[PDB]
Ligand binder design. Structure first.
Ligand SMILES: *[C@@H]1O[C@H](CO)[C@@H](O[C@@H]2O[C@H](CO)[C@@H](O[C@@H]3O[C@H](CO[C@H]4O[C@H](CO)[C@@H](O)[C@H](O)[C@@H]4O)[C@@H](O)[C@H](O[C@H]4O[C@H](CO)[C@@H](O)[C@H](O)[C@@H]4O[C@H]4O[C@H](CO)[C@@H](O)[C@H](O)[C@@H]4O)[C@@H]3O)[C@H](O)[C@H]2NC(C)=O)[C@H](O)[C@H]1NC(C)=O
Ligand code: GLC
Ligand code: GLC
Length: 360
């Protein structure tokens, strides 16, 4: 009976599935967009405004530019930035602190004017940097620990929640379990069912009731204290025994590379026979939990040339979406470090122009 499903026959599949299951209820840090440069740019805006004429300052003390400028593209772009700067300078002692940092406390009118003009090229250089940093901030704002946890809890348990996700067949199998194990343990088909990591573990590892089971296929250390019932009717109790043996922890912070390597590893283990793909040992008839048949997920009609469809199965899609988001955020976080360092440097440069202008 070496060709039947025996204890340990799905042990190596189970190690990969354990790694994936450990993405449930995850508490990870995400790469941070370093937005300290936005504050540095806002300080430069405040200096520029403080040094401006009374006629210019009068424009801010409105939701839109004044008559004549409501259609000027530069005024439309800058209005909120200017308004924020004006608002921040209303705060007690703020303008005095801004001028002091710039060397401009009690500055003569001519020096205030020459200093403001000296900021023109500096601000023009910094604008493009600040706008890229603001774009990065916006583009990555949905890449958060909470959004990742929810997506991964959909992947593992079919539950769109940040924490407290647990095995429930109503969620782990699409529409709950099917009339038969064979139909429940199919994915990608018209009647796709095994659409989460947890359902995949049930199908690859469960002990069916009624004899002729493949208990301990996923490892001899599982203590199957019950069974999954007939046709997975009571899978939850058995799943709890299986998952109790899994200790996996992903690297922290979670990376795109780690998720991509996990999906690649599964892709490398799926085997094609007679027009379907299989994860877990398949002998004949279907993925039924019976030892002489199979303990597996049947990727119905999956072939090497249609493998793109594996990436559309819910759990795979959710993990893929997390990986893609992380892939962008990792790069944009590293970019933002330098954008923010550059903008802080521009702030320091702005605070130095008065010394040059005093000396001539
Ligand atoms: C730092 O703080 C200063 C203020 O101290 C602030 O300066 C102001 O910047 C704005 C935005 O660039 C300047 O707006 C221009 O205003 C002129 C008209 O100027 C008169 O009216 C204003 C408001 O009453 C007075 O402040 C000023 O002293 C003058 O009395 C407009 O003609 C400009 O429009 C052209 O440029 C825009 C910028 O790209 C275009 O969007 C627009 O379409 C216009 O360009 C077209 O027409 C041009 C003329 O024919 C042509 O040459 C172009 O190719 C194009 O075809 C613009 O609205 C304002 O004057 C500044 N005020 C002062 C006193 O300097 C800085 O903005 C602030 N720095 C930062 C980085 O925020
Ligand atoms: C697993 O159970 C099925 C259904 O009873 C049986 O057909 C196989 O022979 C057994 O190994
Ligand atoms: C299922 O059928 C195989 C032979 O095909 C047998 O070895 C198993 O014991 C039985 O359950």
């Amino acid at each position: 009976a070496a060709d039947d499903v025996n204890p340990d026959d799905n042990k190596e599949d189970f190690a990969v599935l354990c790694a994936l299951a450990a993405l449930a209820n995850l508490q990870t840090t995400v790469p941070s967009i370093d937005t300290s440069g936005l504050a540095a740019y806002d300080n430069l805006q405040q200096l520029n405004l403080s040094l401006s004429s009374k006629e210019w300052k009068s424009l801010f003390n409105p939701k839109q530019p004044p008559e004549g400028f409501q259609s000027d593209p530069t005024w439309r772009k800058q209005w909120p930035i200017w308004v924020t700067a004006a608002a921040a300078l209303k705060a007690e002692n703020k303008e005095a602190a801004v001028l002091a940092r710039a060397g401009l406390t009690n500055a003569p009118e001519e020096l205030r004017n020459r200093a403001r003009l000296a900021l023109i090229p500096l601000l023009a250089q910094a604008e493009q940097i600040r706008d890229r940093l603001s774009e990065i901030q916006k583009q990555n704002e949905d890449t958060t620990p909470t959004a990742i946890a929810k997506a991964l809890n959909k992947a593992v348990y079919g539950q769109d929640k940040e924490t407290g996700a647990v095995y429930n067949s109503a969620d782990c199998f699409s529409g709950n379990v099917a009339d038969s194990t064979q139909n429940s343990c199919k994915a990608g088909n018209q009647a796709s069912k095994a659409t989460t990591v947890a359902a995949t573990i049930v199908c690859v590892c469960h002990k069916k009731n009624g004899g002729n089971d493949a208990a301990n296929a996923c490892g001899r250390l599982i203590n199957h204290q019950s069974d999954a019932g007939a046709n997975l009717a009571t899978a939850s109790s058995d799943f709890g025994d299986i998952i109790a043996t899994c200790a996996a922890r992903p690297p922290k912070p979670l990376t795109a590379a780690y998720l991509d390597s996990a999906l690649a590893a599964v892709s490398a283990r799926i085997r094609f026979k007679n027009g379907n793909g299989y994860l877990g040992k398949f002998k004949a008839t279907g993925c039924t939990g019976s030892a002489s048949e199979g303990l597996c997920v049947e990727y119905t009609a999956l072939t090497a040339a249609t493998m793109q469809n594996f990436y559309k199965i819910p759990w795979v899609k959710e993990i893929s979406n997390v990986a893609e988001a992380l892939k962008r955020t990792e790069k944009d976080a590293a970019e933002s470090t330098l954008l923010s360092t550059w903008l802080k440097a521009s702030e320091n440069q702005g605070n130095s122009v008065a010394q040059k202008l005093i000396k001539v």
